[PDB]
Design a protein around this ligand. Sequence first.
Ligand SMILES: COc1cc(C(=O)O)cc(C(=O)O)c1
Ligand SMILES: COc1cc(C(=O)O)cc(C(=O)O)c1
Ligand SMILES: [Mn+2]
Ligand SMILES: [Mn+2]
Lengths: 335, 335
Amino acid sequence: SLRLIATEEAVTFQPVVDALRAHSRTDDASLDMILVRDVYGDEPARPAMIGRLSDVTGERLAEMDSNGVDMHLLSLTAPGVQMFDAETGTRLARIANDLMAQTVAANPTRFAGLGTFAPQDPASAAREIERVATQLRLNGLVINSHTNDLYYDDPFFHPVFEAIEASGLALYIHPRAPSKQIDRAFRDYGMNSAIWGYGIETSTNAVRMILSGLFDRFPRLKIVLGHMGEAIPFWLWRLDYMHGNATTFGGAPKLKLKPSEYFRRNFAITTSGVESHAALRYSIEVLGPENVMWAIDYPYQPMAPAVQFIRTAPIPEDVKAMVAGGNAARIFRIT
Amino acid sequence: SLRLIATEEAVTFQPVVDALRAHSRTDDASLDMILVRDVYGDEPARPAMIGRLSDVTGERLAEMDSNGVDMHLLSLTAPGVQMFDAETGTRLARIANDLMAQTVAANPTRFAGLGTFAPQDPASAAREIERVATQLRLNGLVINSHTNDLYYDDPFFHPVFEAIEASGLALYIHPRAPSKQIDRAFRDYGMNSAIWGYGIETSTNAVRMILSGLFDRFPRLKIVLGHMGEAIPFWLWRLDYMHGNATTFGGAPKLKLKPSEYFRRNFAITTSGVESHAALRYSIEVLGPENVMWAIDYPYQPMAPAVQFIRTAPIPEDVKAMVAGGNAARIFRIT
Ligand SMILES: COc1cc(C(=O)O)cc(C(=O)O)c1
Ligand SMILES: COc1cc(C(=O)O)cc(C(=O)O)c1
Ligand SMILES: [Mn+2]
Ligand SMILES: [Mn+2]
């Protein structure tokens, strides 16, 4: 009877798959090409993945039922539509969002959905964000860290965040591989991926957002970070302590709040890929129990262990209910 | 009467200062030049820092006395001698280590010392490490993350680690600014420094060391990381979980232990710059109480708050004693 709403659950659609299959044959130097060739390539190292990402009502729903999971909140899998040229990305975002709405509508008690967009073209992405919010009535938004090797402090993306803030939709900033600004250090030992690169790429993006003052410009933004907040909850004291030096000697702009206060006000986190009771308890302690959500990270992680992690969490039942689904129901407006 | 041994306490000596003053005028593109110009430059934004780093027996000792701090474990301040050419770095490491040994000998109940080296020349560095251990009999070693924009998984540095392992001295890997591999993303909002770049640079170095299998080659190495382990303690579950993918699809070498097992076996951490009781408790829980040490990070942080942080830590008195000084006395050979 614990209501479980999993918040970082990947899906894909045939038009996006086809575009990535084509993209896999190009000489794109993005570090995401490792993943793209592994999953979408002509000789894939991970040949079952397209099928598992594409499936919603077969194995996925069967696994949900066997583990007592009420819902998946679906998101177009990284790297979404962000690797394509602007026209292509804009077209495919629309298509993927329409298909997400269609998927959710077939089983709305079991699936909710996040829309995505192509920030390669900020003006067009702003229009699509508005369409996602008001015409499709999806539950929120998802984007995969950097676009065009730029981070979201860049004023280039202001029209995107203006539209997101106005829409009231939370934005899940999911990882992708380290951008070209930092990828040189992530070429070895599989560090391009979830084992290290994903967290460094995504957390650096979010820290730039905070320190740049994005949340003074757009104070009603809600951002969600998976992987126990990409470790930002662990760094809060030092982010705050060193901020004086940053604005005094480092040219950082003066902010209305402390870095950690933006993190608690404007961000929430999920437990995707971090099935640690100690890290969960730490995060609840420093963020508050309203700011932590459960996730599986299916199909990149299996459902049973993630479910058992939350069902056995050494926290009171009321807090467990918040983490398991209550918070997600609030943040992603799930009835 | 808690015995307090602070383990990340920076010092400098005139010959190194003079060399950095000269270096500040060069066209070196290293991100450390920001700090170097701010402290050692002809028109320094932080003019009092050289005096504070240079002082051992004046203000530093008075502050130790007024706060009841037993000892500082001294280290040549970042970037140490690593920015110089090999000949210069090698020469200056010898001098700086002799001066460190003399500083310690002058007040051995109040100061312990870490020797440094210039890994620009691994053969010469290996010889200096041996001298530090056997002739100077210093308490350990210190190096500031990368050298020549390479990380310590590189076989280029094997003679260094062979020598460190044989010496039995622990190596404190202190931060410096992000290397050229990653520095593009750390040029804004003061992120070059302790607020973010230091942690990403140093943790990525350490993660490369672990995933490369360095600790299978040299299983007796002891490495110390400040700033609450540069957040690696927070990432342990995910580092372990994703390791199968890394070795299966990512070309990472198979290891004898799990990544988190190398971290507990071969690393210890300090609390420098992270005066959070929650983060301290988390670290003691996941690493064990023997693996956590207290530090101040003087003169970049003030002593009083660091001292009051540990004196008021909500942990049992025997564990507090271990963290405050007992572990340091073991790891750094202090009577
Ligand atoms: C492309 O999307 C992915 C996402 C995750 C994640 O940690 O969120 C992991 C993988 C992966 O394991 O390769 C891939
Ligand atoms: C030159 O070495 C430094 C070290 C630290 C540290 O956090 O360990 C901070 C600063 C700084 O605040 O600029 C400088
Ligand atoms: Mn994911
Ligand atoms: Mn320091």
